[PDB]
Amino acid sequence: PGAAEFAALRNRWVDQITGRNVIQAGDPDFAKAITALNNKAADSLAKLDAAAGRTSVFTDLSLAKDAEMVTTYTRLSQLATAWATPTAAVFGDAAVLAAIKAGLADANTLCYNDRKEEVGNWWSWEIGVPRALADAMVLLHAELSAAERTAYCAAIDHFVPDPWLQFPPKRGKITSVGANRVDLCQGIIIRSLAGEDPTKLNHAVAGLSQVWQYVTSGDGIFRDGSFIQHSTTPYTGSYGVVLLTGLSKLFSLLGGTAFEVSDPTRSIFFDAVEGSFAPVMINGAMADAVRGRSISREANTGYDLGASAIEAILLLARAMDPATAARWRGLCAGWIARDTYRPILNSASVPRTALVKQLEATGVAPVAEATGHKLFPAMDRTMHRGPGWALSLALSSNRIAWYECGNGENNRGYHTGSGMTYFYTSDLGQYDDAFWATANYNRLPGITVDTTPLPDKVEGQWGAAVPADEWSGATALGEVAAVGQHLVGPGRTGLTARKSWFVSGDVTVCLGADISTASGAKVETIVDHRNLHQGSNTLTTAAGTIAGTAGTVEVLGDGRWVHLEGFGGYAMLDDSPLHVLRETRSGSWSGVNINGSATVQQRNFATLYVNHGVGPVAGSYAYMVAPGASVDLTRKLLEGNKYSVIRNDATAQSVEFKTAKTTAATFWKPGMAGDLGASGPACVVFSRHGNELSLAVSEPTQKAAGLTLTLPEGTWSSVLEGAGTLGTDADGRSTLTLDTTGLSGKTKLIKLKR
Numbered sequence: 001p002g003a004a005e006f007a008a009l010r011n012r013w014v015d016q017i018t019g020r021n022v023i024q025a026g027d028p029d030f031a032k033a034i035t036a037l038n039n040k041a042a043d044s045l046a047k048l049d050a051a052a053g054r055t056s057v058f059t060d061l062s063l064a065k066d067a068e069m070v071t072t073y074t075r076l077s078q079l080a081t082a083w084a085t086p087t088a089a090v091f092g093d094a095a096v097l098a099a100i101k102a103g104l105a106d107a108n109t110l111c112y113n114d115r116k117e118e119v120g121n122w123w124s125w126e127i128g129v130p131r132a133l134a135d136a137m138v139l140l141h142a143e144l145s146a147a148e149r150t151a152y153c154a155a156i157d158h159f160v161p162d163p164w165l166q167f168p169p170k171r172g173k174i175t176s177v178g179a180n181r182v183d184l185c186q187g188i189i190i191r192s193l194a195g196e197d198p199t200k201l202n203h204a205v206a207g208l209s210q211v212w213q214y215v216t217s218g219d220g221i222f223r224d225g226s227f228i229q230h231s232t233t234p235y236t237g238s239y240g241v242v243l244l245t246g247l248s249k250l251f252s253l254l255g256g257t258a259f260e261v262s263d264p265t266r267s268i269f270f271d272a273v274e275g276s277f278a279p280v281m282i283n284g285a286m287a288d289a290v291r292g293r294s295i296s297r298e299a300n301t302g303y304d305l306g307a308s309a310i311e312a313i314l315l316l317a318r319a320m321d322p323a324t325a326a327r328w329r330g331l332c333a334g335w336i337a338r339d340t341y342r343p344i345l346n347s348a349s350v351p352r353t354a355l356v357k358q359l360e361a362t363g364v365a366p367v368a369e370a371t372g373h374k375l376f377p378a379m380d381r382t383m384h385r386g387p388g389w390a391l392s393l394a395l396s397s398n399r400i401a402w403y404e405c406g407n408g409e410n411n412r413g414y415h416t417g418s419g420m421t422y423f424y425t426s427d428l429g430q431y432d433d434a435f436w437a438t439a440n441y442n443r444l445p446g447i448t449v450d451t452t453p454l455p456d457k458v459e460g461q462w463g464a465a466v467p468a469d470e471w472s473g474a475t476a477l478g479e480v481a482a483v484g485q486h487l488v489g490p491g492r493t494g495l496t497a498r499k500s501w502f503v504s505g506d507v508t509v510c511l512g513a514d515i516s517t518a519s520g521a522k523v524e525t526i527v528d529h530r531n532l533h534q535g536s537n538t539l540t541t542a543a544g545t546i547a548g549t550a551g552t553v554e555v556l557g558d559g560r561w562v563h564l565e566g567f568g569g570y571a572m573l574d575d576s577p578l579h580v581l582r583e584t585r586s587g588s589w590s591g592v593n594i595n596g597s598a599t600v601q602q603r604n605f606a607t608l609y610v611n612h613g614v615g616p617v618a619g620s621y622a623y624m625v626a627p628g629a630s631v632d633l634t635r636k637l638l639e640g641n642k643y644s645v646i647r648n649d650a651t652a653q654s655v656e657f658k659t660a661k662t663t664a665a666t667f668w669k670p671g672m673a674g675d676l677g678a679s680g681p682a683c684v685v686f687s688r689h690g691n692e693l694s695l696a697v698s699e700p701t702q703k704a705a706g707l708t709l710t711l712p713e714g715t716w717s718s719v720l721e722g723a724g725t726l727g728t729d730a731d732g733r734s735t736l737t738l739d740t741t742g743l744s745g746k747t748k749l750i751k752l753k754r
Ligand SMILES: CC(=O)N[C@@H]1[C@@H](O[C@@H]2OC(C(=O)O)=C[C@H](O)[C@H]2O)[C@H](O)[C@@H](CO)O[C@H]1O
Pocket: 121, 123, 124, 238, 239, 242, 294, 300, 308
C-alpha cells in the first residue's frame, strides 16, 4: 500500500475530526457547534503574539511551561480544524492559515524540536503535543512543505521513538499501558499518516492490542469489568474514557484499510462497553467514584466524561453486528434523554453533534438503567439501582488507594475512599453543581471520619499508599447486596472501623461496629452531606421540623427518622443521637485544583451525622437511607420490623429484609449472625423459597483457599444449583464448604434443597 491509501486515510481523519462531510443544511445544533468553533478560534487569534522575533506564539502562553506548550499546540490544531470546517468563519482563510503555519514553525524552532530534552510533565512532550501536532500536519497537509513535515515528524519521533514505551531516556523507559498506550499510539499513527510511514503505523496499531487483554493485577481491564490506571485507583470514568475515546476514533479511522485493527481479542474491549462502562454511567455522568482526581476539575466533570463515553460508543456502534449496535444505541439514547441538566448538545463539537443527530435518526428507543447490583470487587466499587436512584459506594483496601492526587489536583480528596455513599437521583446536579468546590471534605456522605485535620497530599501523590486493612468486598443475590469495608484511616491516626452496607431494591442499611482511633480526636460517621444548591429544603421529623436555622446544629430525638425535602428519608436503627446541620458553604475551584477558577461558589448543604466522640471503644452506628421516600413512607420505615438488625459488632454485621424474605451479612471473624455462620471473612446473602435455599457468597480478602458456612433455616441435604460440599457440624447443623481459591472477590451463587 502507498500514496493513494495514505491520502485516503488522511482525508478520512480530517472528515472525522471536522465533521465536514456531515454538517446538515440549516440545522440549529450544527449552527451552535459552528459558533462554538468560531468563538474558540477567534479567542486564540486575539491572543496571537504579533511581535517581530517573538519568543512565544500566544501572549498568554509560555513555551517554558509544558502545560502551556501543550495548550499552544492544541490552539493551533483547533485553528486548523476551524480552517478546515465548511461554514466556519475562518474556513479556507489564507491569513489564518498563515498564522497557524507560523505558530507551528516558531513553536518548533523555539521549543518543540528533535534537539530538546523533556522538562516537566512527560505527558506534555509525548501525548499532549504529538496528538495536536499530528492532527495539525494532517489537517494542513496540502499546505505544509515536505521540509515542514520532516521537521515536525522528527520532533515527534524524538520524544516518542516507540509508542509502546514512555518517559524521556534520562528516567528509564517503561511499558505504556491503558489510556497512555492508546494516546501514544494515536499520536504516532496520525503522524504516520502525515509522513506516510507504514512501518511506524503498523507497529503503533499492533500496540493497541495490549490494552484490552484482561489483567489480574496492576493497570488494565479485569474480568469482573473493573478498570484500574495508576495501579491502585478505580479509573473507568476518566482514564477508562480516554482509552475508549482513542480506540473508537482509531478503529473507525482504520476500518476497511490495509491497517484495520484485525485482532479478534478486541472483542474484550467491545464487551467492556456493557461490562465496564455502562454500569458506572448514571444519566449521562460517569460516577465520581471511578474518575479519581478529575472530581477536582470544574470543567472536566462526570457529565463531560460521560458525554465523551457516549460519543465513543456511538462511533463504535457503527461497526458492530445489528443486535449489539442497537443495544449500545439504546443505552446512549437513554443517557442522553434522561440528562436535562447538561444536555449533550450544549457545547458539542461538530463530530459529536453528527453522532448524536445520527442516533436520533435511527429512532432507537432509550434503554432505562436496570435496577439491581453491579459489583466490581477488583477495584473496590459497587453500583446499586432502584426506581429513582443509583447508589455508588467508594471503598479502599490493601489493593485500592484512599485517593489519587497529582499535578495540583484533588490534594484534599483523602476521605473519598472512606466508604462514601453517593446517592445519585433526579437531582442531576447533586455532585456537579460546585459540590467539589464547596463540600466539607471531612464530612463526605457515608464516611466514617477521624476529625484530626490532615495535610493536603497526606499519604502521598499518585495513590502510592493503600490502607493495610483486613478486606473490602461484596456479594449480591437477586435484589439484595452485601458490601463491607474495614476502614483504616488515612494520615496515620489509627482510625479503624467496620463499615457494611445492605442494599435492597429501595433501601440501603448502613452498619458500623468496632470504631476506635489512636489520635485523641472525635470520630464521626456521616449519614449524609447533601448539596441543596440554593434551596432551603425542609428537614421534617416526628416532632415537626429540625435544623431550620443555618449554622445551628440540632439533635434529633426519639422519633428516630428524618425526611429531607426533594431527596427522601433517613432513619436511625439504634438509639444514637442524630446531629442535623443546615449549612451554607463557600469555596473556589482554585481551592481544590491548582487550575481552578477563583470565582467563589456558595452552596447550601444538609449535613447529618453521628458523633462517636473522643476515644470511642467499640464505637458503632446503625442507620438506613431511603432515596425518593415520601414523609408518609419515611415515618413508617421503622414500623413492623421491616429492616430487622440481627448482629452489629466486631464479629458480624447482618440485617433481614422482612419483605424481600432475604437476609444479608458480612463476617469479620469466625462466628455466627443469628443462625448463619461463617469460618472466615465473608459476604453472604441468602433467601429461602419454600424447600429451597438460595445463597450468594464471596470470599472478600481475595486470598483464602476456602470458606465454610453454617447454614440457616434448618438442615439441607442436596445441592440443586452450583458448587460446594455439604456436611454436618458438631451441633447437628448443615454446613457448606467452598473452594474459594483464586476467586478474586467474585460471587458464587448456590442453591440447595431441604
Ligand atoms: C484521564 C486524565 O486525568 N488524564 C489527564 C489529562 O486529562 C484529560 O484530557 C483528555 C485528552 O487530553 O485527551 C481527556 C480527558 O477529558 C481528560 O481527563 C490531562 O489533560 C493531562 C494533563 O497533563 O494529564 C492526564 O493524566
